């Protein structure tokens, strides 16, 4: 197990644009494109939003994709996105010290969160980050679950939280 295999499990692999639970058009292995309008937002609004997502994808791939990519392309955006998550952690004054204090497995769990919620979002978990830095694993686990993140994607958050709790890959074994 490693950060790529871990995120591939949590994000899945879809070759056509889809909408995630937060309302973001997404594709590949968790590659976020743009926000979608209301399930009502006018007939025009919808087409606009979809074309805006297709435009973002074309820009990312460097080709006219029409909202569909190959597995190889999804893996390329994934390599870029994992790289970006790590880079985000290292340039952030709040996340870097926590990342540096963690072991490899727990580092992967932090990259997983940043990949899902972005640098700024994770850097805002001030109390959980402090508990992680203090190696108070069970306390950090309890605190991390008190979040919209956990409530919206509980099965995934539980695996990430268990990874911070144990410092092992047990939550991803047999998946
Ligand atoms: Cl991109």
Q: What angle do CA 131, 117, 45 make, to 5 degrees?
A: 155
Report the 3 state secondary structure along the chain: CCHHHHHHHHHCCEEEEEECCCCEEEEECCEEEEECCCCCCCHHHHHHHHHHHHHHHHHHHCCCCCCECCHHHHHHHHHHHHHHHHHHHHHCCCHHHHHHHCCHHHHHHHHHHHHHHCHHHHHCCHHHHHHHHCCCHHHHHHHHCCCHHHHHCHHHHHHHHHHHHHCCCHHHCCC
Q: What is the resolution of this structure in A?
A: 1.7
- The annotation places the binding site for substrate at 32, 115, 128, 143
How far apart, in whole angstroms, are the C-alpha atoms of residue 66 and residue 53? 10
Domains of the chain: 1-175 (1.10.530.40)
In terms of Cα–Cα distance, which of 166, 175, 1, 3 is closest to 84?
A: 3
Experimental method: X-ray
Q: Which residues surround ligand 1, an ion (CB under 5 A)?
A: 60
Instruction: State the distance from the centre of ligand 1 to the C-alpha of 131, rounded, in angstroms.
Output: 33
How far apart, in whole angstroms, are the C-alpha atoms of residue 86 and residue 77? 14
* DSSP strand pairing (24-28 vs 31-35): antiparallel
């Amino acid at each position: 197990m490693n950060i790529f295999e871990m995120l591939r499990i949590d994000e899945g692999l879809r070759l056509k644009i889809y909408k995630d639970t937060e309302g973001y058009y997404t594709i590949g292995i968790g590659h976020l494109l743009t926000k979608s309008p209301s399930i009502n937002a006018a007939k025009s609004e919808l087409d606009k939003a979809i074309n805006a997502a297709k435009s973002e994808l074309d820009k990312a791939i460097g080709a006219n994709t029409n909202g569909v990519i190959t597995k190889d392309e999804a893996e390329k955006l994934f390599n870029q996105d994992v790289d970006a998550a790590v880079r985000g952690i290292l340039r952030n004054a709040k996340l870097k010290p926590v990342y540096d204090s963690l072991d490899a497995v727990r580092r992967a769990a932090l990259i997983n969160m940043v990949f899902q919620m972005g640098e700024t979002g994770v850097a805002g978990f001030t109390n959980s980050l402090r508990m992680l830095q203090q190696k108070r694993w069970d306390e950090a686990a309890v605190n991390l679950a008190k979040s919209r993140w956990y409530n919206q994607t509980p099965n995934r958050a539980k695996r990430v939280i268990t990874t911070f709790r144990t410092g092992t890959w047990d939550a991803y074994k047999n998946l």
